[PDB]
Amino acid sequence: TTQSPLNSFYATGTAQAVSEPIDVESHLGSITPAAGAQGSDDIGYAIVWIKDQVNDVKLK
């Protein structure tokens, strides 16, 4: 009568990667010496947000 191939069974899921691993927002400052002067000053900072299940980051 009917001979089934016994293959018509399926299960399906989805995957996505919609975000980059890091986000960088800058809060740097300024360097204001006189002409030819020597000095040092703190510039500011830069926030590096870490995204989903990211544990170690290697940057350049």
Please, are residues 20 and 26 in contact by the beta-carbon 8 Å criterion? no
Q: Is 38 in the site for Ca ion (CB under 5 A)?
A: yes
Q: Is 32 in the site for a second copy (CB under 8 A)?
A: yes
Ramachandran assignment for 19, one of left (phi > 0), alpha (psi -120 to 50 degrees), beta (any other): beta
Selection from Ca ion, a second copy, none that 44 binds (CB < 5 to 8 A by kind) is: a second copy
Nearest to 59 by CA among 13, 10, 48: 48
Counting residues that bind Ca ion (by CB under 5 A) gives: 5
Q: Which residues bind a second copy (CB under 8 A)?
A: 4, 6, 9-24, 26, 28-39, 43-44, 46, 51-55
